[PDB]
Amino acid sequence: HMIVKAKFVKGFIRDVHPYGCRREVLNQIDYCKKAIGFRGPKKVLIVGASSGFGLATRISVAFGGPEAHTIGVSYETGATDRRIGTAGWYNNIFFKEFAKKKGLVAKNFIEDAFSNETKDKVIKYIKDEFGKIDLFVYSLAAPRRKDTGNVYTSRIKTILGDFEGPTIDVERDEITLKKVSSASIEEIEETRKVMGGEDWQEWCEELLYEDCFSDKATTIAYSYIGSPRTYKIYREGTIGIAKKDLEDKAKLINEKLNRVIGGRAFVSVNKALVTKASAYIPTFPLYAAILYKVMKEKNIHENCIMQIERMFSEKIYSNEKIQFDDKGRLRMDDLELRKDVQDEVDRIWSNITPENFKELSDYKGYKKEFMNLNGFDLDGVDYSKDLDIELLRKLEP
């Protein structure tokens, strides 16, 4: 029986507020329940289903109109003697509670998605109990990958020279300059192993050859391109190299699925959102804060769930044909990269100071979204209320 507070250690919040996480899940569900609605997917596999885009994907297909049954694969840990548990751990639990209330299947595999054991387990469940899958979304954003037993670690670096610029320190409400430098050859390769398209492709092949995909099944992975201002990181750097690998694999998966089941694969390039991993990378967080202000002013702002909802209802499962860019990618950053939006961001950038940034950018919204990632600062949650830790320990995914 304890009060959970937001304690910052080396820039990151230590604990998560589980009921704040519940509320965030519920806010996304609410958005989807009230949106125009779409139809299509019935049986959906999501690898990386516990947070961010994977979670929004799951909520969207379940509550956004299709009433899809879902399998979520994620590695998360619960409450112990000393730890409260990860946000994703709770997101899984609360998603399942709300999905079942609607009479939907919401299976969780709390498992390392990279291992052959996990694939076998998921495949067995599909063949035995779930039924064939019409949509497979790969949205794992793991920091490392275990293979023999080599461990590969993702890094966020340039391939040449320094990248430096402002980050947002949420704890002190200030801008702070940071720098990241060049990656080693091994670091580039490891990042490609973790973030590239290899595991996604393995999944698609196992699923395909084990007769787990429905005819005409779709599979999707997520990426980010952004503005030229951060190309050194997101296109040219270690992340950019991994994402090009992801894009290349999408093409090979697409060709195969098309030939074998009339299915398809593609990368959806999404918009800038606040995440833990991009906090403290130089120059992105300020970009995002300014972007939020501009797009909110222009009535075109989207958070994670809004991105996904529009992706599904307006582009993927719409009446009209799907439009890809010239490299076969679905572009959900079409509003972010709109000329008028980028012109305004660059203008504000040229006036922004460490002194005035809270007025020229959406620092408030940036900070709120950051806090929300650990279940803090959610409207309608009583943070003075103590939490029953033995009750939380009882919850099962």
Site residues (CB under 5 A) for Na ion? 48, 52-54, 139
* Minimal distance, residue 287 CB to Na ion, in Å: 21
* Minimal distance, residue 206 CB to Na ion, in Å: 20
Is 90 annotated in a binding site? The answer is no
Output 52 or 196, the one with its CB closest to Na ion: 52
State phi, psi for 171 to the nearest 5 degrees: -65, -40
Output 139 or 307, the one with its CB closest to Na ion: 139
Give the C-alpha separation, 249 to 329, whole Å. Answer: 12
Give the C-alpha separation, 49 to 55, whole Å. Answer: 5
Output 241 or 273, the one with its CB closest to Na ion: 273
Output 24 or 344, the one with its CB closest to Na ion: 24
Longest dimension (CA), the chain: 60
Output 139 or 167, the one with its CB closest to Na ion: 139
Is 79 annotated in a binding site? The answer is no
Is 113 annotated in a binding site? The answer is yes
* Minimal distance, residue 60 CB to Na ion, in Å: 12
Is 53 annotated in a binding site? The answer is yes
- CB 299 within 8 Å of CB 338: no
Is 190 annotated in a binding site? The answer is no
Is 127 annotated in a binding site? The answer is no
Is 48 annotated in a binding site? The answer is yes
Q: Give me the long-range contacts of 326-331 (CB less than 8 A, separation at least 24).
A: 327/247, 328/250, 328/251, 328/254, 328/266, 329/223, 329/247, 329/250, 329/266, 329/267, 329/268, 329/269, 330/220, 330/266, 330/267, 330/268, 330/269, 331/268, 331/269
Q: Which H or E run contains 200?
A: helix 198-209
Instruction: Count CB neighbours of 2 within 10 A.
Output: 10
Single out the catalytic residue among 138, 234, 292, 366.
234
Instruction: Count CB neighbours of 252 within 10 A.
Output: 13
C-alpha R_g of the chain? 21
* Minimal distance, residue 140 CB to Na ion, in Å: 7
Mark whether 234 is an active-site residue.
Answer: yes
Residues 6+ apart with CB under 8 A from 135: 40, 41, 43, 44, 45, 61, 68, 217, 218, 219, 220
* Minimal distance, residue 260 CB to Na ion, in Å: 27
Which position's Cβ is nearest Na ion? Answer: 54
Q: How far apart are the first and last CA of the chain?
A: 22
Strand partners, 107: 71
- Binding residues for substrate, by number, are 224
Residues annotated catalytic, as ranges: 234
Which residue numbers belong to the known binding site? 48-53, 75-76, 112-113, 140-141, 224, 243, 273-275
Going by the annotation, the residues of the binding site for NAD(+) are 48-53, 75-76, 112-113, 140-141, 243, 273-275
